[PDB]
Predict the 3D structure of the following.
Amino acid sequence: VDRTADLERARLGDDGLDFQDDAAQARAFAQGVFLLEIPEWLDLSAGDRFARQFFQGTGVEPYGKYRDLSSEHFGDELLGYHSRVDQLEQFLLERRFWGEVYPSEIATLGEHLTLLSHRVLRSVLASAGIPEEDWHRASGGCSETNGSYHLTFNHYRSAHQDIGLSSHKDDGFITVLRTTAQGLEVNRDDVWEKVPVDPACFVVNFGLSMEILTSACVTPLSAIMHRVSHQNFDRSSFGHFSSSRCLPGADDGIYRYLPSAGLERVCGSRELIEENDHEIYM
Ligand SMILES: CC[C@H](C)[C@@H]1NC(=O)[C@@]2(NC1=O)OC[C@](C)(O)[C@@H]2O
Ligand SMILES: O=C(O)CCC(=O)C(=O)O
Ligand SMILES: [Cl-]
Ligand SMILES: [Cl-]
Ligand SMILES: [Fe+2]
């Protein structure tokens, strides 16, 4: 693909998300993807280094050892190191383990991104016309700080003859993606387009839970279809993912908002992730 998407750029300011104007904000939310300026005080260098190292094993300091932590170590099949069928290999960790398992500076990064994402999500919920007292249940806790949050590190193995990462929608409400190299593509309006590279911005997009939640609103919001093209050289990235609380045995559920009525349950949060990962990776 040779077309490059023209995305709207936003900033977090005194009143929440600031786009250039109300029309720009509407286009961004209608597309389900936009750029978000990275706060100047926020240090991403340890996260960038973790994404470059996590897969390399205990010979490589300080982060290569996370290659050896599989899902078995967490009692949760979703977490730890995972080789995917595509070029991608990942390390995924939910917030309840960050303080104990991640390096301290990586847990700190995760916490910063959680509070940034929280602020982004609340701006979106307000634009959707959902009553504020329904936000906590509608977002499975992400309208406050009680959601499930995964800080997930990605490395694309260019020696594998696969697509980088198959076409998919994310599971949750908000993904804050840190990417510094080409490869991410988005499908708005049934044409694949490259996401412009800008290491001064995150890429923000909505997941399936945002789409389900707002599907009956006057302006439904989409979970952007996106992929990573086959990489001829290595690539890395990381993202902060916000989902309805999906702990084993403590699942907040996924809801659709019915204007003038309230929230109706659609499915489980973990169930949605499992069904989505099935539909993606085959
Ligand atoms: C347990 C997953 C968690 C809810 C979150 N959501 C996701 O969609 C993602 N990663 C995450 O960290 O999992 C699958 C994926 C397409 O590779 C993407 O990277
Ligand atoms: O690496 C990227 O740019 C995208 C990663 C992604 O889409 C995901 O982890 O769900
Ligand atoms: Cl601010
Ligand atoms: Cl590329
Ligand atoms: Fe994604």
